[PDB]
Symmetry: C2
Amino acid sequence: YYAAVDWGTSSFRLWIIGEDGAVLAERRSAEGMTTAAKTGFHTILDGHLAAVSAPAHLPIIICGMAGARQGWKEAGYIETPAALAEIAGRATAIPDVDRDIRILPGLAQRDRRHPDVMRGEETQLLGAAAHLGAGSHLVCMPGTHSKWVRLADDRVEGFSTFMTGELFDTIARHTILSHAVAEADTFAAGSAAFTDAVSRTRENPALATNLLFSVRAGQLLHGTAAADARAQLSGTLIGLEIAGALAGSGSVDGVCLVGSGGLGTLYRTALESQGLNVRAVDADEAVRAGLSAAARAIWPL
Amino acid sequence: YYAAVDWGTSSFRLWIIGEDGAVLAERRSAEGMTTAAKTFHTILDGHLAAVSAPAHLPIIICGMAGARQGWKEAGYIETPAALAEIAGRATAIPDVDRDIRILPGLAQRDRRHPDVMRGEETQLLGAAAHLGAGSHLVCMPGTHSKWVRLADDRVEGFSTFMTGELFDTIARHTILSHAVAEADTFAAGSAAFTDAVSRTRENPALATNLLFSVRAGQLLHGTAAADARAQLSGTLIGLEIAGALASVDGVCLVGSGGLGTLYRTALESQGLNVRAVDADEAVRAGLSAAARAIWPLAENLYFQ
């Protein structure tokens, strides 16, 4: 019996978990990191606990941006390489309250040639890894920042962020490419526009910023439909991510994909188009499971 | 004789020219094609009034004044294209008081590799003779950086890389604004810059990871804003060259000022010779060869 919270930058999810593992209650809102920093983390939380009649001494495990510098209380990082089990033990307690409330830290790769950082995904990893062996895994965690993580023996060995989602959104809205992709809201992951682009760039990463301009040139000279231009932009950026993810990885078979929604489908299509097997793990199921593994290790029954 | 106008996306430049060949006056500002579609004559009349231009001095204009989202759509001549075709394909802007033309751009129509250039073809009209003869490879940096295979007053093909526009939007609208924002500049020579260019030119695949690292670098160690900016610029540029190079010794850079330095710096570090050429000297020249061609002047039969 604990609450578990995924505190994101623009949203908030909470689950009350009973003694037997079952979800007894669930709450979900827009009060993410940026709202809570104006109006108060503790108050937003006390709101949801009251709304579902939590006991006053129900303990609470949190992951994500509630633990960033701009959040409720800095949770910091654990340096990789690091056993997945270190996470729960290095959680930060909220100091002047009558409830055990703890926030899990991010992971940091301090290497000077490859500095890298994650906050949130580590907890999804904790939930995902329970479904896999203790053997070797290359794990893809897509988003505004896709994380590619090397798991072995239940340790995170290292990881690489690729800013593909953030790049997509800036290129689509703030550059000339917006005149080619604005008219379209969606595209079909299954379309050739998409997987052709993933292949052009995966095979020719060096040309990336020529290929991006080609989406605009293509439109001007040949009337590329907005949906296909959107796909093309999308595919280019994700194919370049894949190229980087695999740049001397030996042979890799062999990828586990932690994702959900249309995002998860886009990536799976992308990865499978480049000849990789995919093992899907549902991103939301994995946070809860990650948050539950930590709770069971800090408050054992 | 003529007004020459180079009307870019973000900048306006004018030169008044005499039958002698000399510049007589000049105007600069930052009203480019995007600002101009706010106000399309008025900007042109203002600068003309300013410099005391004859009311019927004709006007030759290259650049984005000729795009769809501009003054009037000029065309494109498709590649390979003889540079000498350009002036003949110019497009009038109706005016009873003056003969105003805009130069077309070039288009590479290949369905793989579609590509487009509006203005750099006039810097190439300008510079073809000077550069020399036979095959050249010319790099033309800017918001959109052009790489052009030139031979005998002929563009054979070319490649845009959108490195400048990427630098800007990445610097202003992504998380990296936190890493670079409160710097405005960085010294081309700084090792932060050529390291970025080299690790990226060597590992194109990792580009969008490398970009994230400037911010993770700033979070974990405390990178100085100029070194971050440099890393940023360097990464983008290293990537361009990787792509441009996808043996040449062996390149001719056309550019001016800050960015010109930055690229020679970046290009030499990758082991290339850089025969440089001033950017504005090549445009004024390209607009001159067009002007002489449609409004040839009355010669003195006894001279040459």
